[PDB]
Design a protein around this ligand. Structure first.
Ligand SMILES: N=C(N)NCCCCN
Ligand SMILES: [K+]
Length: 333
């Protein structure tokens, strides 16, 4: 579809497209990771080692000493920059194809409705693209997190109404204004707006990357709850019914049985996985459903190695694997 609008033809890139880097922001002394900084860093080591076997990894941290934990890992690069937190999925630049070339977008990030400090995270993209990539960066005057949106690459996007229409985000516009703006920015034909569904512990106002994800052009993998007494049951059932009306094939990702840290339910979701070259890295929570979701996804993705990575520690700060990384795609810049 050769559509041009105000000088540009735009294509949205799905996660399974070929990538150059996976980018992460390390936990450090002055982040909210402090009370268990070593447990989370041990988990990062595993995550990084697994990804590095398939494609390059870029680690962003505010001190040289933060990199010394990862020094002897193949295909790992380092970049010095100050950070508030580690959730680069939400503040990291987002690639699109603009007139046949890769171009990165730099949306404004306010930490999910100014729930935490966000001034340093906001400036990571400017500095990274100025010092490392030495590459122009498109400023977009619009509050958006990458975790709140999901693409199939044929011009269809997936998102949640509760997040994007929240008064703590872009309150000054309405649904029609927002739906229009995002279609122009990513050159989309369609946006699917999910009214129902959440994961308990999620402090991001119902990010789509905890609920439903495209795994190929035709297939959406989405969360459900097998336990009818769990608060997740009918919210995810209603969400499942919305998803049936889209016409896409569906793959079910049953949530684990409740996990707690300091008498607080953790937001475990198998939807927070990440595509890299030739592999899909999936979060494992040491529930019996780890095996079940791994077999399902693996059978549905015969060109990928599906790899489980222990993601329990990530949940203490209310995100998982996908939340903790950002994809930078391979192509002409
Ligand atoms: N990546 C997300 N969607 N959320 C991360 C939780 C942020 C709370 N410190
Ligand atoms: K930004």
């Amino acid at each position: 579809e050769n559509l041009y609008f105000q000088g540009h033809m735009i294509k949205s890139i799905p996660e399974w497209s070929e990538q150059e880097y996976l980018m992460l922001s390390l936990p450090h002394e002055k982040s909210d990771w402090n009370p268990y900084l070593e447990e989370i860093l041990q988990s990062y080591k595993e995550f990084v080692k697994v990804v590095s076997e398939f494609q390059k990894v870029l680690l962003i941290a505010p001190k040289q000493s933060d990199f010394e934990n990862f020094k002897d890992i193949k295909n790992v690069e380092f970049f010095k920059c100050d950070t508030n937190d580690t959730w680069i999925r939400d503040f990291g630049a987002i690639d699109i194809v603009e007139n046949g070339r890769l171009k990165a977008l730099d949306f404004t990030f306010n930490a999910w409705g100014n729930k935490f400090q966000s001034e340093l995270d906001n400036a990571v993209n400017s500095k990274l693209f100025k010092e490392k990539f030495k590459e122009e960066l498109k400023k977009v005057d619009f509050i958006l997190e990458g975790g709140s949106i999901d693409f199939n690459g044929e011009g269809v996007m997936l998102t949640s109404s509760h997040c994007l229409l929240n008064e703590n985000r872009n309150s000054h516009l309405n649904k029609t204004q927002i739906d229009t703006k995002l279609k122009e920015i990513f050159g989309l034909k369609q946006i699917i707006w999910l009214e129902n569904g959440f994961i308990k512990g999620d402090d991001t106002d119902h990010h789509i990357d905890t609920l439903a994800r495209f795994i190929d052009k035709n297939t959406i993998a989405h969360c459900i709850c097998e336990d009818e007494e769990d608060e997740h049951y009918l919210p995810l059932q209603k969400m499942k019914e919305e998803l049936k009306k889209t016409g896409f094939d569906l793959l079910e990702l049953p949530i684990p049985k409740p996990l707690y840290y300091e008498e607080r339910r953790l937001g475990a979701t198998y939807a927070n996985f990440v595509f890299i070259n030739n592999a899909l890295i999936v979060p494992f929570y040491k529930d019996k459903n780890d095996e079940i979701i791994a077999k399902r996804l693996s059978k549905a993705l015969p060109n990928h190695k599906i790899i489980g990575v222990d993601a329990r520690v990530f949940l203490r700060q209310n995100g998982s694997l996908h939340s903790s990384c950002q994809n930078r795609f391979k192509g002409l810049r």
